[PDB]
Amino acid sequence: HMQLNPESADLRALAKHLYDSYIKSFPLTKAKARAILTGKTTDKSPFVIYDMNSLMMGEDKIKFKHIQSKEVAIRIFQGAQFRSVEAVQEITEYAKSIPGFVNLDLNDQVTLLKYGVHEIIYTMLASLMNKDGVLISEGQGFMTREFLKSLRKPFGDFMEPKFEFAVKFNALELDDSDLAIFIAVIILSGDRPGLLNVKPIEDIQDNLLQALELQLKLNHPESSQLFAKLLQKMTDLRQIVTEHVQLLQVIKKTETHPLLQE
């Protein structure tokens, strides 16, 4: 049976430390995202882009964090790629707070993040999504799934696999406490190619996996095998990163950010 012992309370404090660090590193949390999407907040209501006219109005009235193609589909995709750059910085800052992580060979630290950030971005996009669309511009905007889908090939299909993932992932009803540990388990994957010292990465992952399992048992009385289900999702995420990477080939060879410039 489960007991509240020194080992369990260490795993609870590890879970609490990752939660705290998660709140620090990602401004817009799932709790906040959900309050916006369900109209259960006093915060300013996001501008809905649902067609070409509301996008035109939206570009003006949703002031973005950077900024020029005549083509709407390309300008949307660009904003997405810029926000993904920002997301890498946030996820790296989070990685530094995982006990043992900054103690790994810097080269191994770079490899874990290099392969992980795309899996963590799709995880965190789900937090921002419902069946109708995705919160953008840290929640100033909402862009509908069908408006994204109406964009000319090959841009019309860029977000569809994220929405597919998100419909099934959000049905698990994870909260920010669950996701903080989930995201830390993904970063510490000992099977990324080109790692020097695997064993020290698996030792931290083993501790994170124990913490995740305890988190999901305490937090989710309704699904006794959520732990198993959540590991099956890490298996999925690989595939959607595969589809994303092969689509970034088509785009780059078929069509034409300030921190890359410096």
């Binding site: 750059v85 890498v88 910085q89 790296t92 800052e93 530094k96 810097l106 630290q109 770079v110 993040l113 290099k114 950030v117 921190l259 890359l260």
Partner: peptide
């Protein structure tokens, strides 16, 4: 490009 961002973000 990614490595570069991660590396400076790490230091």
């Amino acid at each position: 490009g990614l490595e570069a961002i991660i590396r400076k973000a790490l230091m």
